[model samples]
Target: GLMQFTLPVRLCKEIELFHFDIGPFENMWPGIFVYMVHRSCGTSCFELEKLCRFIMSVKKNYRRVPYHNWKHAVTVAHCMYAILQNNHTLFTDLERKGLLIACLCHDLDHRGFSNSYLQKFDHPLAALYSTSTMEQHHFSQTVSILQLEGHNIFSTLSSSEYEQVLEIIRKAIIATDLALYFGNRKQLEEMYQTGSLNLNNQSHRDRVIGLMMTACDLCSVTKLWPVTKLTANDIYAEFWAEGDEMKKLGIQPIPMMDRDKKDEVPQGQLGFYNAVAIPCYTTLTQILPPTEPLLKACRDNLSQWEKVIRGEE
Candidate 1:
């Protein structure tokens, strides 16, 4: 059993980011983090003050980047929460909390650079991780926050229980890197097609958890047209910023990363939807029927991008 902690009656406002209410909201993310842990695992999974401090600390570590900032992390976490809430039975109670926390902490300290950029520049993060690059660093940053004083939210849990939670957090965070998604998605597709996906099994649980994170990481595509359109701009702007750096370093960046090629964004978004978002949610909704709306939203956004690409005002 999980150790329990007491929260005073005056603190329910900390959880203003409820699902039926629409958004986790900007700058209110830290509270939502606390609220989700409390919601999923109860006060037993965390000390109130410690959880609040840890959430804020997690927020502080995120760089002021355009796309990978704290806002992006919270959005991912909110998406994870939405997906999990749709079918709570899809994951264990402890794992639901783990999924949200991991989503919130997944991109901690992101440098506004992709793993490819990290490797091409021979950055220290790349040297250390070699394969997943920044994902490893993000996981490390999460551990740092948990280890710091007044931030051990899991201190309420027993030692072994905390370890399992940490492992889940690590696996979920690392899966956000996308490099692992290709093979894993293929495996999951085959598993589903063969009717062999048993959620009761640990490996199967891990597989679905990985895809869920990726789906939520790209959750912008599952939003309404306004959000999806604006999010595309933010993402392209971030890539273009990297393009400036790449040009300064004497490398000719690709069109998607180049500021001058901004007009290509419509087609670029179209290609991304067809290639990644559609296929992703297709497999995901097939395996997890509760998220069918997420798939519909993806197709809706894909159509929007298509209209934009065809020069239709």
Candidate 2:
């Protein structure tokens, strides 16, 4: 009876268990935090699961669609998990759980492409939420989904427990948006200059966790070489496809994606890296040296882009 291998049917059933299964709220870190928050902060586990399900379901709206699917959610979740793993002692169990949960649902219902696309389309979501306000709306909606009375994920938690969970989730999710990247860097710099980074207290630790999550979200430049190249191509393809769509719809296209031949990936990436990611993350590393490897990755990728510009790729 001591078999080394499980049957294919058995393996399938086991996979089903892990797939999208949040399991017991009290046993899982994020689930526990969600349960606690519902008691104090008024968030419910029932509602949170709905939000999670929405995140897992909304794939057709993604920029690259299927290929760039729920996997991004899983990736961000892993990044958040890594941050928590690396800085476990800094955060309370509750804080870690909430942060992880926030990261998992941050991009729920994202409509693919960039914020620029939303602006171009006069999207209702964009109109109702401007810049940071838009991101705030996204976070609030996640909570709103979880607060639907009997549908609330924290329906069983006490008031005090729920509040702590809500605060942590709110802070973590808002930090993931790319639009807040520059502001986060500025705040980190301020914290460094004031020696606030040395604080080991719970609040300060949560701040650092949020910052780390933001850093990882903006970490595309620091990826492995092959992944970096593939991501660049994906971005390029998205831009080009969106531009073509805009033109077909009689709308003006952004520079890089323009079908007029006036814009190109190699140029766009060169400018994007040299002008954006490099300067931004380099400044970040000046305050947090742990960011150096990612910066170096960007620099190396930029060199590849430059070669392409020179017709050497």
Candidate 3:
């Protein structure tokens, strides 16, 4: 038996999964993905039982890292879920399915460390891929999950459709590497500004999904103050852990990653907003006005971080 459905627009809001409030309840997240996937692939495209098994396997694959754990991955996936809820027309159904899975699996098996940390330390994964080292590993891990028996959630898709979706998944997962995003951002930003972005073009769609992945990956900064506040500390924990490892190797960690310089994080986060997240949400919202809340939240949280910098919070 098979069925087809999308989560009602109202129901997505009813669950509060589409918003920032669910962060504190870590255990409740797996259930939240149920709705995102139902909307993403629909029952007709995937068997529910296989989707359940595949998602559980993915959750277990994520290491118990401070920030990039299952929690962070699901949070990023929800951002894409919320965005697609209102702007559903922008992506094809296959692209939408790929984006959700990509967001969910983007950081699979992350070592709670950065790409530069790997390369600078001569780690094997760094050497394995000439560029986007950790990113390529995440994509590889995603393929591993699908390769597992009973985890073929794409079983219902036609062979050619499955092929296209895998290509989408690989690129979307790699796009989460902020290293690759900067140049793509500039290109998309200019195309957006000059009125050159065309819905009719496949390349334009590819570039847009790449930008969307980066935006969703960074959306923790765009959440409400309470959620964003706790999330930043978790991220700092992972950074400081990496920083400690750097110190063990006789390398001085950068100020942003150093635990001793915790006070400097406010300035660093502001710089992150100015240099990366802001432009991303700005350009994205311009292309799809319904997504403006993401840009709005990014601006609102920047002031909260700014006030902390002023010693006024």
Candidate 4:
């Protein structure tokens, strides 16, 4: 069984409001994750308590990295929670559970390095999985944790339900790879433009779930300016650290990874919003109108970044 703790009922209610920021309180993450799972999946009190232990264990497993740490995992999961609350009717209970769990575990055991850096260095993980190297490791680590005694919070699920949830979780976790985001985005955009998307269609729905995973993975882009800027700096710190390591190994760093070009943050962010985030939120809102707030926030950030690029901010 997991350690027992009391969650503030008010915080659980406030979580759905999408206004309160959870970034400052590190201790609240495990309880918040447990609360989200309990609310979304209808777990019994006993299951929730065990689930708390599972979540805490998962958080402990996260490395002390700059960006892909437990705090980032919680932030991603919180975004998923926000989306599920607003689009509660858009997903089945299993899908909701899978998405939340996937978000929570998507960056498990991350080494503060990019997939390209890993592969370029011939890292063990690169050899283990030919494609989606980090994502595969993340899912594998998630499974290993779930296999630990008292860590299988899905124990209450029926046998088939358990298997189904695992499958969805695996797919959703892998979908967090930004390399896959372009294809998913294009498919979603095409469906939106052609009006051919059908939520009732299993394949189409799965595609949307994959895209949703991408949105949650980069949810900072949709956050307010201060949060977005802080997140970007943290992320770049991680990237620059990796670049420093690569330099030690006599490897040249990519432009974005080079700390020498730190001044380009605003321009890089502008390109990211124009090339990835804006289109992403636009398609998401077309499918789920309640997500317009995310789009609006991203656009606002985009405008701010544009001003920064032009020396107007």
TM-score of 2: 0.66
- For each candidate in the order shown, give its overall lDDT on alpha carbons: 0.80, 0.57, 0.84, 0.84
Candidate 2 Cα lDDT to native: 0.57
lDDT score, candidate 3, position 105:
94
Q: Candidate 1 versus the native: TM-score?
A: 0.90
**Candidate 3 off by > 4 Å:** 1-18, 23-27
Off by over 4 Å in 2: 1-68, 144-158, 194-210, 245-251, 259-263, 279-293
lDDT of 3 by residue, 1-313 (tens): 4443334465446544334544466656766777667765564656777877888999999998888989888889888888888786777888878888889999999999899899888999987897888889999999999999999878778999999999999989888889888898888888987989897888888888888899889988887798889889999999999999999889999987899999789999999999999999998888778888889889999999899989998
RMSD (CA, Å), candidate 2 to true, equals: 8.3
How well does candidate 1 match the true structure, expressed as C-alpha RMSD?
A: 4.0
Q: What TM-score number comes out for model 3?
A: 0.93
Q: Show the lowest summed lDDT stretch of 10 residues, model 1.
A: 13-22
Candidate 2, 1-313: lDDT as tens digits: 1212222454324322211122223124333333333432234334555544444333222333532334554545544444444343545656655665576567655544566677677777677776754457557766765655444545555798789888777777776665666666666668777877665666555556566666555555556656667666655666777787777668888787774664467787787887667866575566455446556777888888888889897
In candidate 4, what are the lDDT values of residues 1-313, reduced to their tens digit? 3444446777746677544356578887777777677666565533765677788888888999888999878888888888888887878888887888899999999999999989889998899898999999999999999999988878878999999999999989988999998998899889988999999998898888888888888888887788787888889989899889889889989878899988978888888899999988888888888878888888999998888888787
Angstrom error at residue 301, model 4: 0.8
Residues 196-279 of candidate 1 have per-residue lDDT tens digits of 989888988898999998998998888878877877888887899888988978899989899998888888888888878888
Better of 1 and 3 by TM-score: 3
TM-score against truth, every candidate: 0.90, 0.66, 0.93, 0.93
Worst 10 residues of 4 by lDDT: 40-49
